Amino acid sequence: QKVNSNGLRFGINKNWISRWTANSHAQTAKWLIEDEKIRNLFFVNYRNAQVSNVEIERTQATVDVFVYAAQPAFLIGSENKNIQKITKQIKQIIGRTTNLDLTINEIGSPMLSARIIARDLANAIEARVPLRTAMRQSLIKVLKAGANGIKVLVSGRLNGAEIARDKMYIEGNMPLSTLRADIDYALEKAQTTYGVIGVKVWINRGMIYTKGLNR
Amino acid sequence: VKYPELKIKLESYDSTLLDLTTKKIVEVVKGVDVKIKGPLPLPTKKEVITIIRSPHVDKASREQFEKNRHKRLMILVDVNQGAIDSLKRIKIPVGVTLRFS
Amino acid sequence: AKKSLKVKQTRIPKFAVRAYTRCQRCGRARAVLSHFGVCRLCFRELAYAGAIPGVKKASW
Amino acid sequence: RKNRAPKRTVLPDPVFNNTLVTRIINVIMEDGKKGLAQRILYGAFDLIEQRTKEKPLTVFERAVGNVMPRLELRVRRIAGSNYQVPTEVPQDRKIALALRWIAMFARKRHEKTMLEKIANEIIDASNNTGAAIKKKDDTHKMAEANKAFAHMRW
Amino acid sequence: LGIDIPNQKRIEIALTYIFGIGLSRSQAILKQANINPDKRVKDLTEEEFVAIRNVASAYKIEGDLRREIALNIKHLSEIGAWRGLRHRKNLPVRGQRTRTNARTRKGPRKTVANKKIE
Amino acid sequence: QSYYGLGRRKSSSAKVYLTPTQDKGKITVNRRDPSEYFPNKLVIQDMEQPLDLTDLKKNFDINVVVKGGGFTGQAGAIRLGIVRALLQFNPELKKILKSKKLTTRDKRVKERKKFGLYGARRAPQFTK
Amino acid sequence: RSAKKGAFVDAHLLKKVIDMNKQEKKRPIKTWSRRSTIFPEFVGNTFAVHNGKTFINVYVTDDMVGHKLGEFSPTRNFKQHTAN
RNA sequence: UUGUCUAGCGAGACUGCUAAUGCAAAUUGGAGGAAGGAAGGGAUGACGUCAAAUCAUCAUGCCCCUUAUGUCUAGGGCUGCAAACGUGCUACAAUGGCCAAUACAAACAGUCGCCAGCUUGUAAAAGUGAGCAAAUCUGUAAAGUUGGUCUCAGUUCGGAUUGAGGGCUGCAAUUCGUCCUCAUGAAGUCGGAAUCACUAGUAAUCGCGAAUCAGCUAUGUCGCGGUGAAUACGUUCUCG
RNA sequence: GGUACACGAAAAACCUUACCUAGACUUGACAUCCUUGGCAAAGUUAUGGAAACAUAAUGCCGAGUGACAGGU
Ligand SMILES: [Zn+2]
Secondary structure (H helix, E strand, O other), rough: OOHHHHHOOEOOOEOOEEEEEEOOOOOOHHHHHHHHHHHHHHHHHOOOOOEEEEEEOOOOOOEOOOOEEOOHHHOOOOOOOHHHHHHHHHHHHOOOEEEEEEEEEEEEEEHHHHHHHHHHHHHHHHHHOOOHHHHHHHHHHHHOOOOEEEEEEEEOOOOOOOOOOOEEEEEEOOOOOOOOOOEEEHHHEEEEEEEEEEEEEEEEOOOOOOOOOOO | OOOEEEEEEEOOOOOHHHHHHHHHHHHHHOOOOOOOOOOOOOOOOOOOEEEEEOOOOOOOOEEEEEEEEEEEEEEEEOOHHHHHHHHOOOOOOOOOOEEEE | OOHHHHHHHHOOOOOOOOOOOOOOOOOOOOEEEEEOOEEEHHHHHHOOOOOOOOOOOOOO | OOOOOOOOOOOOOOOOOOOHHHHHHHHHOOOOOOHHHHHHHHHHHHHHHOOOOOOHHHHHHHHHHHOOOOEEEEEEOOOOOEEEEEEEOOOHHHHHHHHHHHHHOOOOOOOOHHHHHHHHHHHHOOOOOOOOHHHHHHHHHHHOOHHHHHHOOO | OOOOOOOOOOOOHHHOOOOOOHHHHHHHHHHHOOOOOOOOOOOOOOHHHHHHHHHHHOOOOOOOHHHHHHHHHHHHOOOOOHHHHHHHOOOOOOOOHHHHHHHOOOOOOOOOOOOOOO | OOOEEOOOOOOOOOOOOOOOOOOOOOEOOOOHHHHHHHOOOOOOHHHOOHHHHOOOOOOOOOOOEOOOOOOOOHHHHHHHHHHHHHHHHHHHHHHOOOOOOOOOOOOOOOOOOOOOOOOOOOOOOOOO | OOOOOOOOOOOOOOHHHHHOOOOOOOOOOOOOOOEEEOOOHHHOEEEEEEEEEEEEEOOOOOOOOOEEHHHHHHOOOOOOOOOO
């Protein structure tokens, strides 16, 4: 019954993910539903790309979809066979009059980004791997990545009925209630053959003191 | 000249992001152009939205957001067409939108 | 009766009154906000995801 | 359970110079409207000035003094058919109860206009009639009749 | 046709008592006949009573309102009409909710024991 | 020798002025008699009740321009403006003006209507 | 009242009623429009107005005009309340 | 008869100093100050209980249907009615009703909209028509003050219900839109057992704005401002 | 029951609407894959109908095919 940690500290310590503006209540809904199709399309199509987040840059028929991933080779493909396909797919799903010129950039220390960690947990769970060993291994790798404590809790069918047997782990100072904490959050819906598995990962990346405002 | 009283008014949804842009503009125009009176704060036209939390009745526990919109105001006494030629390169970010005259 | 209702809205109605509002991401046609073309709960979860550019939390 | 709470300070009325007049003007208040209750009370004072020629302050002080109750009955139940225990009442609460009784028995009578009805109430209270002196004497009679309970009580 | 106009009150209200003349058209008659408002019914000159009666005869007869309303109801009922069917059984007509409220026409009350809850 | 002041009671800002004049003080609010501007009650004396504890209208012109508020909030705003003006007039008035607690900007302002509450403090009702 | 060209007809029943009036007035005609108002020309014939389930016959009379044609057709049956 | 004003940055408030008593946290008082001892308010809600609510926001395992439990359209219904409960509005009145004159707000919103002014209209509104992409133009504030009338009655209180005539949106107003004018004027005279909210700009009260929306007896919800109280001795009883 | 009852519903005359009656349709109003292609697709006008609709012309889109689409 607690608020999402990503939305609580949004706009006061973390910049907006889709920075743009347009005419009042006329077609901002159209852009809001169209650009989001890119955001969901990446996370659905390219599981192994390990994309962390994407930033949307729209102003008067121009779009710049910034991408952050650990393995850009899958997005690029072999001799640029996949970048043209992905950019033409984005064009077909966004329109024809807007220049796109996307970029693909590396992420520093990926193992401390909640999104890809949750994606790996979902992949491990859907791969019939026992939950405890995979979760412990991911915890160990993220802690060794050089971050603060982790809070992973997973619900769903834990290889059987009586789903209300969720498992949670905490291994360090994770002050969710502190706005000045710079806490990153993400969620993934692991889809096992028996039901739906929900994985939530909270990652602390050090305090954000003296940052003034959104970076 | 040939373009007196260039009243450029700009608004956005953030304060620091707009303050940086207006400082950059007032500094870049501070060359050949002269008599640029400082930025004029505006009431920050604001709108508040209230959304109930749960998908079910729960009507007694509702949260609410608030889409802020800041606003400043620049006015130029003389265009000094070299000044506007230099001004073509201000390259404002996406958050700040300008309404010219 | 959800996909048919979703596709019906896009189709132009034979009278202007027959047209109604509905969000683009989900087929709910109730509590939609015309200012965003999105239902109350979607808008909540999208703002939590930060998709809307102007979002904060309240102090008023 | 809680702890003791502070009490605010009332400003003197800056025409007639009396705090008890302010307590009247706040206890007769309804709808939160000073410009109406003030007219009511000052018209009543003018009526006091006109008939039975006498300074309104003297009549006010006489009526208030005659109305203040000596004892107060506070309910303390032990079993079924609860018995009462008389208790001593502070002077601030004394004037509070006196002015409450004056106002509440004023706003229930004949002589339709509020002006004349409250003026008659205060005149009768000054003259010790059965308007509010009767109720004060009745609740006083309820005291010291159960005084056996009052002596041994908490 | 002068039916019990009370005394010790103004003429403007004295004309509001006959069946069919309310506050507004009584004032219209008052301004038409040049009768002065603020005259109590007593001490009123006859000279202008005939003027009031003439201008009232120009209006609808006060006793004729009941007959006209009854005739209109009979006209609406004799033809097969849902409103006539609605109006016949003493149930509200203009569409007010009848689930729990609207008891100003249905009668004072008739209570019946509800479902025997277990 | 004009003197300034400022009061902001109940979201109503009041600009006051003082000047010694041969008259009794020439009370004036918005270029019109306060006897008609404000409702003639104790409130028109609540503005000079600071002057009660000092030289009441010895020789002090009153020129005040106000914005916002109702009428009692205006009275408090102009009262605080006047007291600020007199403490500017003589720093020795600190002792007796603060004694009555006439300055200090009582800052009692309406609350925010919380969700589920009719008037920011009251719940609709309770039933079982 | 629409207050301007208020008397309204569904514009697809006028042709039928005119044709029937000019064609010996064949007694039964089937309409499903309750929105139409009856003109002074409507008098003479009958209609099978749709109450929702069946077709109930109604005979217009110059006794009435302007009552909503559908007002002649009741839609909900009686309460006839059960005791409990 | 100008430094209010809105918005960026900063200062200020931190038991900072003093007196008392305590090892020490710390409590009380006082000086100064705008605020003094978490300065008023909000967001911020742990492990878990109620197998609490939601397959009808969405996603989803399984089961089931598929030339039908799928799809379109016309008409009806969610608005019924012998009844009961809950939440609110109106009231039961001279602390008022009606009429005239008249002064003081914040916030929010608007180029299919806000609609100024003018003409017509008993009014709802219609026609003309500038101004505004908005600190500029528009959304007459009402309670409040004064004057006149009413004189305690089922009334110049209360307006329900009902009949007629108009105006608006909409293809379309009967099922089932609301607004205005005329017509009558239900019940009610402070309400049984028993209960409800509230510790200051709060309760009460008077208006204003917004969402959804072509329009909607929303008297609802979310906000804004004006007037503006009474009390708290105390834990014996009562609830958690 | 506290934690339902001016609640989901921040707008039920048509649509909304998930129900009933009736009129109609069957790889379907909308979607992927296969083959085979490029001239249509939204709207308009009479005509029968109440309207979906079947006709006639005006002004990314077809045809066949099964897993299926679809279920408030
Ligand atoms: Zn949605």
